[PDB]
Amino acid sequence: GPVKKWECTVISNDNKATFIKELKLAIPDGESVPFRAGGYIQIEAPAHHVKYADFDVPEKYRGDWDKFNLFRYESKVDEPIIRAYSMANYPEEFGIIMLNVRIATPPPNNPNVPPGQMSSYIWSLKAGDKCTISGPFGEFFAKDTDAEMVFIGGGAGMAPMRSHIFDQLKRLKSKRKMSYWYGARSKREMFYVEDFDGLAAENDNFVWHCALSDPQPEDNWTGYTGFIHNVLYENYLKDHEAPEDCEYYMCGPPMMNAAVINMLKNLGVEEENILLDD
Ligand SMILES: Cc1cc2nc3c(=O)[nH]c(=O)nc-3n(C[C@H](O)[C@H](O)[C@H](O)COP(=O)(O)OP(=O)(O)OC[C@H]3O[C@@H](n4cnc5c(N)ncnc54)[C@H](O)[C@@H]3O)c2cc1C
Ligand SMILES: NC(=O)C1=CN([C@@H]2O[C@H](COP(=O)(O)OP(=O)(O)OC[C@H]3O[C@@H](n4cnc5c(N)ncnc54)[C@H](O)[C@@H]3O)[C@@H](O)[C@H]2O)C=CC1
Ligand code: NA
Known part of the structure; x- marks a missing residue:
C-alpha cells in the first residue's frame, strides 16, 4: 500500500571498475522516483541461477577476474530476495535510476562459500531485462545550512x-x-x-x-x-x-x-x- 513500486527496464549495466557495475534503469512512462539525494531503493529478484562465466566483463577489467579465477562462481537462489542500493543520479536526472553495484564475491580466505545473492543477480542483467524497484527510502540527507x-x-x-x-x-x-x-x-x-x-x-x-x-x-x-x-x-x-x-x-x-x-x-x-x- 504505502510504498511505491516500479517495474523497470535495464538501459545498460556496464563495468565502471573491476568490481563495480553501473546499473541504469528506465522508469515506466518516463516518470521519476520522488527521492532525495542520499536515499536508496530496494531491488527485488525472483528465484534464479546465474553463472559468473556469463557476466559481460570487458577485457580492460578482466585482469583480477582471471588472476583470482572469479569466473568459477555460480549463484543459485531458491526464493525471491531484496536488497538496498543508493541512487547515483540526483532527483532532476528524470526518468532513470542509476546504481553503483559492487560484486560481493566469496572472500579469498573462504572461497567456497556462496557468492553474494543480489549483487550476482544484478551483474547477470543485460540491456532489455526487467528489474523491479520500490521506495524511495533513506535518511542520509544533506543538512540545510551554509557550512562548507x-x-x-x-x-x-x-x-x-x-x-x-x-x-x-x-x-x-x-x-x-x-x-x-x-x-x-x-x-x-x-x-x-x-x-x-x-x-x-x-x-x-x-x-x-x-x-x-x-x-x-x-x-x-x-x-x-x-x-x-x-x-x-x-x-x-x-x-x-x-x-x-x-x-x-x-x-x-x-x-x-x-x-x-x-x-x-x-x-x-x-x-x-x-x-x-x-
Ligand atoms: C541503505 C543501504 C544502501 C546500500 N547501497 C549500496 C550501493 O549503492 N551499492 C552496493 O554495492 N551495495 C550497497 N549496499 C549493500 C547491498 O544492499 C548489499 O548488502 C550488497 O550488495 C551485498 O548483497 P548480496 O546479496 O550481493 O550479498 P549476500 O548474499 O548478503 O552476501 C554477502 C557476502 O557474504 C559472503 N558470504 C556468504 N556466505 C558466507 C559464509 N558462510 N561465510 C562468509 N562469507 C559468506 C558472500 O560471498 C558475499 O561476499 C547498501 C546497503 C544498505 C543497507
Ligand atoms: N551504505 C551505502 O549507502 C553504500 C554502500 N556502498 C558500499 O561501499 C563499498 C565500497 O567498497 P569497494 O568499492 O570494494 O572499495 P575499494 O576496495 O575499491 O576501496 C576504495 C577506497 O577506499 C579506501 N580504503 C580501502 N581500504 C582502506 C583501508 N583499510 N584504510 C583506509 N582507506 C581504505 C581507499 O582510498 C580505496 O581506494 C561496497 O562494499 C558497497 O557495498 C556503496 C554505495 C552506497
Ligand atoms: Na571549480
Missing part, C-alpha cells in the same frame, strides 16, 4: 556522493564551498571523471581530487596516492583554519569510514558534523 561541505567517497560509495554533489550544485544552485575526495585502487577503477571535471569547471565553489591507493605500473600516475583520508588530511585539512566548521559526508568501505572518522575526531570535528548512511 567535504565529501569523501571510496569505491562503490561513489553513488550517494554523486547524488549529493549534483543535487547541491544543479537543483539547489548552492554557493556553498564544496570539495570531493575520492579513493580508487588504481586508474582503471576511476569513473564519473567527466561528470566531476565538468562540475568543477563550471562551479568555482566545487573542486575534486582522486587518490589511488594501489596505482598500477601502466597507470603512469603522477597524482595523489595512498588512502584518501591521508590525502585529504595532508593536502587540505591539516592546514584548515577551522575544520570543525565543515560538514563531512562519507561513503566507502568500512575501513575507509573508520579511518576518516578517527582523523576528523582527532581534528576536533563534532559528531553532528560527521554524516554516514545507516
Whole structure:
C-alpha cells in the first residue's frame, strides 16, 4: 500500500571498475522516483541461477577476474530476495535510476562459500531485462545550512556522493564551498571523471581530487596516492583554519569510514558534523 513500486527496464549495466557495475534503469512512462539525494531503493529478484562465466566483463577489467579465477562462481537462489542500493543520479536526472553495484564475491580466505545473492543477480542483467524497484527510502540527507561541505567517497560509495554533489550544485544552485575526495585502487577503477571535471569547471565553489591507493605500473600516475583520508588530511585539512566548521559526508568501505572518522575526531570535528548512511 504505502510504498511505491516500479517495474523497470535495464538501459545498460556496464563495468565502471573491476568490481563495480553501473546499473541504469528506465522508469515506466518516463516518470521519476520522488527521492532525495542520499536515499536508496530496494531491488527485488525472483528465484534464479546465474553463472559468473556469463557476466559481460570487458577485457580492460578482466585482469583480477582471471588472476583470482572469479569466473568459477555460480549463484543459485531458491526464493525471491531484496536488497538496498543508493541512487547515483540526483532527483532532476528524470526518468532513470542509476546504481553503483559492487560484486560481493566469496572472500579469498573462504572461497567456497556462496557468492553474494543480489549483487550476482544484478551483474547477470543485460540491456532489455526487467528489474523491479520500490521506495524511495533513506535518511542520509544533506543538512540545510551554509557550512562548507567535504565529501569523501571510496569505491562503490561513489553513488550517494554523486547524488549529493549534483543535487547541491544543479537543483539547489548552492554557493556553498564544496570539495570531493575520492579513493580508487588504481586508474582503471576511476569513473564519473567527466561528470566531476565538468562540475568543477563550471562551479568555482566545487573542486575534486582522486587518490589511488594501489596505482598500477601502466597507470603512469603522477597524482595523489595512498588512502584518501591521508590525502585529504595532508593536502587540505591539516592546514584548515577551522575544520570543525565543515560538514563531512562519507561513503566507502568500512575501513575507509573508520579511518576518516578517527582523523576528523582527532581534528576536533563534532559528531553532528560527521554524516554516514545507516
Ligand atoms: C541503505 C543501504 C544502501 C546500500 N547501497 C549500496 C550501493 O549503492 N551499492 C552496493 O554495492 N551495495 C550497497 N549496499 C549493500 C547491498 O544492499 C548489499 O548488502 C550488497 O550488495 C551485498 O548483497 P548480496 O546479496 O550481493 O550479498 P549476500 O548474499 O548478503 O552476501 C554477502 C557476502 O557474504 C559472503 N558470504 C556468504 N556466505 C558466507 C559464509 N558462510 N561465510 C562468509 N562469507 C559468506 C558472500 O560471498 C558475499 O561476499 C547498501 C546497503 C544498505 C543497507
Ligand atoms: N551504505 C551505502 O549507502 C553504500 C554502500 N556502498 C558500499 O561501499 C563499498 C565500497 O567498497 P569497494 O568499492 O570494494 O572499495 P575499494 O576496495 O575499491 O576501496 C576504495 C577506497 O577506499 C579506501 N580504503 C580501502 N581500504 C582502506 C583501508 N583499510 N584504510 C583506509 N582507506 C581504505 C581507499 O582510498 C580505496 O581506494 C561496497 O562494499 C558497497 O557495498 C556503496 C554505495 C552506497
Ligand atoms: Na571549480
